[PDB]
């Protein structure tokens, strides 16, 4: 349907009961997390947010993003460096809703 | 003049695609067991009922 979730640093207007991948907050895998903060839910838009309404998320696995090999190479110099960014991803879905 | 770089394998293949030999014709030869090219010699070495040449 719809619901707004601000995960970590980014914001996402998504639908109800969808699994999405964000930057890892180390949310527990299988145990539920409540967030009273929510906007654009139950077809109603409250003034700042929605009150007495929650986004209710749960993670099914905290996997690691594929090998992000970032390489900085400088043209006509001897600067050739590499680093492996491995970002855990919160693969989380929102299950139930109050309004 | 003289070259500047080398051409790739696929460019060469495209070049040699039209560098092929021409085609031919097909024709049933009356005095032979097989067909032949139109107005040429057959597998039996005769254009048709008239024999044109020897074999050896």
């Amino acid at each position: 349907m719809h619901a707004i979730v601000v995960c970590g640093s980014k914001q996402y207007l998504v639908h109800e009961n969808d699994t999405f991948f964000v930057e890892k907050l180390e949310a527990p895998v299988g145990k539920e997390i409540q967030l009273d903060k929510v906007l654009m839910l139950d077809e109603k838009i409250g003034a700042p947010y929605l009150e007495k309404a929650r986004v209710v998320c749960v993670v099914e696995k905290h996997g690691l993003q594929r090998k992000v090999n970032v390489i900085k190479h400088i043209s006509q110099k001897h600067h050739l460096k590499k680093y492996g960014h491995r970002q855990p991803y919160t693969k989380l879905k929102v299950v139930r809703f109050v309004h | 003049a003289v070259q500047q770089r080398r051409s790739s394998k696929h460019r060469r293949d495209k070049r040699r695609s039209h560098d092929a030999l021409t085609a031919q014709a097909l024709s049933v030869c009356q005095k032979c067991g097989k067909k032949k090219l139109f107005h040429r010699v057959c597998s039996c070495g005769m254009y048709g009922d008239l024999r044109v040449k020897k074999a050896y």
Partner: protein, 139 residues
């Protein structure tokens, strides 16, 4: 598949050889023989002996239909090659690379011998993942 014909280090231009035996690729014996018989070159008289050998093997020692199969693929590759030089102007010599090649033709009864290759690669993939999972259940 079986009764494939191979010849080693025959002196012939790759262009003329590939043309004259690609006129035969994908065709049977007689239908391609009667179309190669009119080729004004000096390559059919050398190539046809390998095909004759293969088909005679098929007739006597294998005993298949013979006409069911067709020339699946001819390849004249970059094997041993020739280089002959002749004295010429300015005290130097001109060297011409008299190309030679290891000719080989494979006969197939079906579009396979290339399908079976991808099938073999995929079977290799499948047995590889079977082994990798056996490692992954033995954690």
């Amino acid at each position: 598949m079986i009764a494939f014909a191979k010849q080693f280090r025959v002196r012939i231009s790759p262009q003329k050889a590939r043309l004259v035996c690609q006129l035969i690729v994908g065709k049977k014996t007689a239908d391609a023989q009667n179309i190669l018989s009119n080729t004004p070159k000096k390559a059919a008289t050398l190539i046809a002996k390998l095909l004759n050998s293969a088909i005679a093997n098929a007739t006597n020692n294998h005993g298949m239909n013979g006409d069911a199969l067709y020339v699946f693929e001819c390849v004249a590759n970059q094997g041993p090659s020739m280089k002959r030089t002749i004295p010429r102007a300015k005290g130097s010599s001109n060297m011409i690379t008299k190309r030679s090649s290891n000719l080989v033709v494979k006969l197939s009864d079906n579009p396979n011998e290339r399908q079976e290759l991808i099938k073999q690669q995929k079977a290799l993939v499948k047995k590889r993942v079977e082994g990798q999972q056996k490692a992954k259940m033995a954690r």
